[PDB]
Design a protein around this nucleic acid. Structure first.
Ligand SMILES: [Ca+2]
Ligand code: NA
Ligand SMILES: [Zn+2]
Length: 254
DNA sequence: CTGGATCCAG
DNA sequence: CTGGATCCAG
DNA sequence: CTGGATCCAG
DNA sequence: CTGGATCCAG
């Protein structure tokens, strides 16, 4: 990845907001890949499409890009409130890219946030624009990401440095199982991913997994069928291309 | 027209 | 954190 | 929807 | 039997 914008694109513009739109969307089109499946390039939706900047034409994941000069805040500016409210609840609800760029118009940080982390609760309605305003009565919104987990933020470029796309695809696919709250309970798929990651190396077996039985039992005290559950969860992780089934109780991390 | 889109600016 | 000024398109 | 339980190919 | 597939309850 190269980290600088194509400044020529914005010669004819005056608004720094509109310049940011052009420069950041061009950069992502030219330089980013699908953090879910690894497809490059992402495809750009048509202009004005609500909360819909890019799609991956391989896996159908959608992406909303939010960009800013400087540093991230937990509060993010957006578009129309009503259509945000509708898009976060859609079956094809978008994942969210966050991009920071420097005073030299180069990409400082670039991360993805899995889609489950932007919920209707996150979306804060703004006061309508005054009737003095050009867009009088427009109701915009801000997104409150304060509650998002540290681990939900998956960096593609971090403080100047491009990260390995395979580390990112791995982390994103794990991230899609991550729970909206620290207060929400354990969750099987998460706890099993946790065991998998405690196993050294790429290859493992069902017997390796059944060693975590006593540990899983403490967590899920009412589960009297732990082994069956381990097996069911491995099937879930397979269907998501997180592991491969080698046949008869043998697995490999992807 | 109306109603989406940008994030900047302070 | 809050309120706008640009842009874009059916 | 997800946690707990059941089924049966091989 | 063993491990992948499926069902049922709240
Ligand atoms: Ca955007
Ligand atoms: Na957009
Ligand atoms: Zn993809």
């Amino acid at each position: 990845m190269e980290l600088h914008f194509n400044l020529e694109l914005v010669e004819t513009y005056k608004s720094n907001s509109q310049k940011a739109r052009i420069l950041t969307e061009d950069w992502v089109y030219r330089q980013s890949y699908c953090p879910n499946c690894g497809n490059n390039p992402l495809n750009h939706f048509e202009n004005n499409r609500p909360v819909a900047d890019f799609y991956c034409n391989h896996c159908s994941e959608e992406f909303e890009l939010k960009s800013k000069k400087g540093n991230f805040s937990s509060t993010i500016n957006d578009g129309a409130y009503a259509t945000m409210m509708k898009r976060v609840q859609a079956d094809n609800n978008p994942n969210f890219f966050f991009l920071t760029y420097t005073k030299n118009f180069e990409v400082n940080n670039f991360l993805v946030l899995p889609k489950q982390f932007v919920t209707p609760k996150s979306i804060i309605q703004r006061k309508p624009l005054a009737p003095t305003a050009n867009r009088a009565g427009w109701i915009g919104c801000n997104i409150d990401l304060s509650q998002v987990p540290s681990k939900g933020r998956i960096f593609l470029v971090q403080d100047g440095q491009v990260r390995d796309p395979e580390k990112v695809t791995k982390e994103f696919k794990q991230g899609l199982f991550l729970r909206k709250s620290s207060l929400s309970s354990r969750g099987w798929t998460i706890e099993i991913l946790n065991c998998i990651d405690k196993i050294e190396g790429s290859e493992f077996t069902l017997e390796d997994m059944y060693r975590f039985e006593s540990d899983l039992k403490n967590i899920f005290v009412k589960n009297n069928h732990i082994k069956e559950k381990i097996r069911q969860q491995l099937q879930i992780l397979r269907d998501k291309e997180i592991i491969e089934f080698k046949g008869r109780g043998k697995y490999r991390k992807l």
